[PDB]
């Protein structure tokens, strides 16, 4: 039989407003990709017509605004079944394998979608930011909480970055914890935490703190921008299954990442 791979990739967007959870706007998108090995070139020469490639997406209820690949698809309530169009898949794969003859696999966009999200609960990193703006000074507090409830199974957030612009004419940085980095040319501060999870200190609950001395002042609060990626889980809870013989999954990769992930004062 032929080996094949799958990938779910979800992007989470959030916007927090000070400490008020009711005001947090959330939007999660996502993409499903099927991948085929180079061998297929020779395999679809020894075969056509090949065995029908049919799959099912599990927990399809959790998805909204679903756009199936128009060249390859779609012409109950929690499960959806798809029969891929084989002639077009083959046409495509032949085109890409002539174009990149020295490629080990070919990725094919199969599904694009939104994920219904219920506010702060659907957010893997809860954030709340507070600014105290003195005429001659500035106090910044960033509270964060790793939230297992947003994700199918509990896994870490990697390469977490907190970036925030400091207006007003910064001069000195005092009382910083944990250590951060000052960009003087861009007048902005950046914290990096490599790993945030339940296995982290305080169970993913923590605070970034900074104090700034102002040459002019006072500062106007600017949006905190956040970055993180995560491997091993979706936000949706969707999986995939093969239906019918001929094909085997060698790997189903699930991952997610912040897109526009912001927090105002």
């Amino acid at each position: 039989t032929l080996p094949v791979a799958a990938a779910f990739t979800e992007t989470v967007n959030a916007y927090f407003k000070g400490a008020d959870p009711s005001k947090c706007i959330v939007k999660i998108t996502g993409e499903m990709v099927l991948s085929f090995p180079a061998g297929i070139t020779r395999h679809f020469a020894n075969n056509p017509s090949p065995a029908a490639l049919t799959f099912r997406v599990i927990n399809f209820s959790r998805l909204e605004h679903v756009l199936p690949n128009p060249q390859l698809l779609c012409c109950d309530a929690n499960t959806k079944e798809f029969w891929v169009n084989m002639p077009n898949l083959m046409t495509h794969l032949k085109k890409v394998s002539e174009q990149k003859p020295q490629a080990t696999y070919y990725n094919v966009d199969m599904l694009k979608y939104q994920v219904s999200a219920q506010g702060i609960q659907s957010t893997p990193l809860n954030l709340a930011v507070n600014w105290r703006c003195e005429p001659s000074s500035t106090d910044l507090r960033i509270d964060y909480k790793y939230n297992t409830d947003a994700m199918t199974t509990a896994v870490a957030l990697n390469n977490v970055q907190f970036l925030v612009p400091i207006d007003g004419g910064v001069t000195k940085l005092q009382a910083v914890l944990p250590p951060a980095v000052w960009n003087a040319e861009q007048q902005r501060i950046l914290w990096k935490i490599p790993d945030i999870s339940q296995k982290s200190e305080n169970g993913g609950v923590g605070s970034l703190l900074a104090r700034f001395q102002l040459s002019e002042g006072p500062s106007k609060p600017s949006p905190l921008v956040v970055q993180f990626t995560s491997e091993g889980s979706t936000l949706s809870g969707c999986d995939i299954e093969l239906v019918g013989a001929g094909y085997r999954f060698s790997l189903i990769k699930k991952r997610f990442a912040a897109g526009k992930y912001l927090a105002d004062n």
Binding site: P3, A7, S35, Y105, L251
Partner: peptide
């Protein structure tokens, strides 16, 4: 954007 990069799915 490659979801598998750089690891190999068929190994």
């Amino acid at each position: 954007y490659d979801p598998f990069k750089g690891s190999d799915p068929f190994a």
